[PDB]
Amino acid sequence: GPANKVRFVTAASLFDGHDASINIMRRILQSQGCEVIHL
Amino acid sequence: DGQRMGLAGMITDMAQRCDIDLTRYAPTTLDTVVAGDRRALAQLITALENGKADPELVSALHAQAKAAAVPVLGITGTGGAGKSSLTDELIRRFRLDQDDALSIAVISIDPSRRKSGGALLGDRIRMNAINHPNIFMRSLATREAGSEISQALPDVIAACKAARFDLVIVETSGIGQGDAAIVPHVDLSLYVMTPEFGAASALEKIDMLDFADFVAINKFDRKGAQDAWRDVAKQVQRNREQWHSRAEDMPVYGTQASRFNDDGVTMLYQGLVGALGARGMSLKPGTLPNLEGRISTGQNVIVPPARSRYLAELADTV
Amino acid sequence: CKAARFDLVIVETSGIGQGDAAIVPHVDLSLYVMTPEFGAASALEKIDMLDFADFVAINKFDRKGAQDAWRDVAKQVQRNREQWHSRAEDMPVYGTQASRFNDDGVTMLYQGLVGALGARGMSLKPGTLPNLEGRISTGQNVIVPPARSRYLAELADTV
Amino acid sequence: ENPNQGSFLIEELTDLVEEAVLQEFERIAERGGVLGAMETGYQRGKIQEESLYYEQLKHDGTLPIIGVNTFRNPNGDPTP
Numbered sequence: 001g002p003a004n005k006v007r008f009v010t011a012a013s014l015f016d017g018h019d020a021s022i023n024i025m026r027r028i029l030q031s032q033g034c035e036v037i038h039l
Numbered sequence: 040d041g042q043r044m045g046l047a048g049m050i051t052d053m054a055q056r057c058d059i060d061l062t063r064y065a066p067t068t069l070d071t072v073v074a075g076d077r078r079a080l081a082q083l084i085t086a087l088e089n090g091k092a093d094p095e096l097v098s099a100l101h102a103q104a105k106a107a108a109v110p111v112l113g114i115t116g117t118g119g120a121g122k123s124s125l126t127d128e129l130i131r132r133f134r135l136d137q138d139d140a141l142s143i144a145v146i147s148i149d150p151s152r153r154k155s156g157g158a159l160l161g162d163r164i165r166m167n168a169i170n171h172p173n174i175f176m177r178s179l180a181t182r183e184a185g186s187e188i189s190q191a192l193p194d195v196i197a198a199c200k201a202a203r204f205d206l207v208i209v210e211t212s213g214i215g216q217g218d219a220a221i222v223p224h225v226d227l228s229l230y231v232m233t234p235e236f237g238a239a240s241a242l243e244k245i246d247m248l249d250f251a252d253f254v255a256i257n258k259f260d261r262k263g264a265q266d267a268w269r270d271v272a273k274q275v276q277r278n279r280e281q282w283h284s285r286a287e288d289m290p291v292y293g294t295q296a297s298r299f300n301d302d303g304v305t306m307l308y309q310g311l312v313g314a315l316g317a318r319g320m321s322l323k324p325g326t327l328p329n330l331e332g333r334i335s336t337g338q339n340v341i342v343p344p345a346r347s348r349y350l351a352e353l354a355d356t357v
Numbered sequence: 358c359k360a361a362r363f364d365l366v367i368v369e370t371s372g373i374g375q376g377d378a379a380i381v382p383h384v385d386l387s388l389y390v391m392t393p394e395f396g397a398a399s400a401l402e403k404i405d406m407l408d409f410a411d412f413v414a415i416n417k418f419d420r421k422g423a424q425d426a427w428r429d430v431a432k433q434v435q436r437n438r439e440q441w442h443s444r445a446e447d448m449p450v451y452g453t454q455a456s457r458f459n460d461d462g463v464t465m466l467y468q469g470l471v472g473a474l475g476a477r478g479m480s481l482k483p484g485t486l487p488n489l490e491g492r493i494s495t496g497q498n499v500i501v502p503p504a505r506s507r508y509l510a511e512l513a514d515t516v
Numbered sequence: 517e518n519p520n521q522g523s524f525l526i527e528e529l530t531d532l533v534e535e536a537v538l539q540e541f542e543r544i545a546e547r548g549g550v551l552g553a554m555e556t557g558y559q560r561g562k563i564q565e566e567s568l569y570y571e572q573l574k575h576d577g578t579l580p581i582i583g584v585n586t587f588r589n590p591n592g593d594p595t596p
């Protein structure tokens with residue numbers, strides 16, 4: 001594909017104790033072969 | 040709608056839509072860079088990463104780096120050792136002692152996925168103490184099949200050095216045993232280790248110890264802390280061939296990163312301050328309690344392991 | 358070595374790092390060993406060797422977190438496998454104990470490897486050992502139940 | 517069969533040795549069981565170190581051992 005790589009960042013807004021949504025988003029993005037910094 | 044069209048398809052459309060590179064948007068000079076911008080700094084970093092810059096620019100970068108004269112400290116070790124936490128603690132101690140009067144740069148390198156093509160640059164998460172304009176951090180991926188360093192790592196190192204910062208810390212990905220990709224390019228070497236590392240004889244074939252400047256063992260909670268430290272110190276002495284010293288004085292100290300205000304952390308910071316002074320970088324006189332010692336005494340620990348399994352005792356009582 | 362007309366070829370590599378999986382195309386079957394002390398659960402999702410290992414074994418329940426590591430590793434193997442519709446406890450990951458002789462998990466791994474070799478069509482005789490089942494050894498034939506590791510502390514308190 | 521009559525010293529030594537032994541017991545327990553000790557070679561190395569220290573001190577001569585470090589009779593040492 002294109003020499004460029006997809007760089008993403010994922011997180012949750014202030015004061016929402018749930019986190020699994022971040023994980024579900026990020027693992028799928030990773031499956032799509034995109035580099036993401038999850039903070 | 041997410042259930043109807045599917046999250047998978049939504050992500051595919053999101054991925055394909057955002058597909059365009061920003062290569063044309065790079066600058067052509069270093070004047071605004073040495074000025075102090077950050078967005079242009081990231082622009083230069085990216086352009087060097089993809090190698091879209093003229094060799095003249097890189098030559099000027101190297102020329103300025105030859106006048107940089109700045110500390111380049113690398114920290115590496117086994118995967119899952121926890122080097123990132125140690126780096127965070129070191130940065131925190133730096134800020135605490137020097138009253139936020141330094142210009143700290145941090146570079147991390149993470150492995151790529153050799154199959155899917157993507158990666159998970161998951162190291163900035165552990166660090167938390169970078170909420171300041173005077174400390175800058177950056178992450179890069181592997182992107183290459185074989186090594187564990189960038190195809191342009193020296194270039195980005197020189198670029199970061201040119202920015203008139205105080206000290207640059209760099210960490211690679213988790214290393215094997217036969218790898219020394221951080222040795223020749225950097226100035227100072229910190230290697231992390233764990234108590235669960237195998238037999239004592241196995242300690243004699245970790246090639247990283249050969250060039251290691253300072254070795255620290257993390258997470259002293261587990262068994263064999265003292266025994267592991269003894270064996271590590273003895274092996275370091277043997278490899279150094281400095282038979283004139285006794286064992287306890289070798290420059291190897293191990294700390295427990297996770298628990299707050301570890302004494303060994305302060306000891307290692309004191310040692311590294313001495314090391315930088317021996318290499319001569321400008322810094323203010325020390326201000327923290329500069330203790331002596333070699334291994335943390337587990338200070339302020341909640342439970343002396345002497346009472347770890349109390350619940351079994353209570354059950355037996357019942 | 359293959360030209361020597363032997364039954365089986367086994368090759369052990371050097372201690373690996375994280376980005377190293379060079380053995381993938383040169384051999385047929387992949388066994389990857391691991392320790393309970395490996396780092397955080399989120400960390401393990403970056404060990405590329407799991408993308409090709411036909412079998413993964415955590416060895417020795419010396420330290421703690423053995424069952425925790427087993428659960429996490431099995432779940433991540435499922436996650437990378439894309440075999441969603443199957444429960445984890447059946448995944449091809451087994452945890453054993455080297456030092457202990459006659460370990461149960463070793464036997465389980467041997468039975469699985471026999472099955473795998475039969476899949477590739479390797480001539481051999483029918484089985485002879487008691488074909489036991491399970492996924493993790495119970496630590497049978499152990500000298501002391503870990504429950505009483507620190508008996509000397511009890512004696513000192515007694516005195 | 518009981519020479520303790522008149523003895524502070526026997527009791528003092530007994531209690532001190534008992535405390536030292538129990539402290540070493542606690543250290544052994546913290547080492548994680550005798551089997552773990554055997555696996556890690558803790559006591560083997562400890563004995564090695566203590567033997568080296570003892571031999572070093574004996575060769576130093578700062579410990580009085582009769583008839584080895586002194587009283588070297590001028591007749592040489594034939595020892596058939």
Ligand SMILES: Nc1nc2c(ncn2[C@@H]2O[C@H](COP(=O)(O)OP(=O)(O)O)[C@@H](O)[C@H]2O)c(=O)[nH]1
Nearest residue numbers: 119120121122123124165258295296297298397
């Ligand atoms: N027991 C213990 N665990 C630690 C300590 N420091 C870090 N850890 C563990 O290490 C994990 C972070 O590892 P990390 O630095 O992200 O992995 P790395 O980036 O590959 O070095 C945390 O989840 C902690 O559980 C410590 O001092 N003691």
Ligand SMILES: [Mg+2]
Nearest residue numbers: 119123161162
């Ligand atoms: Mg990491």
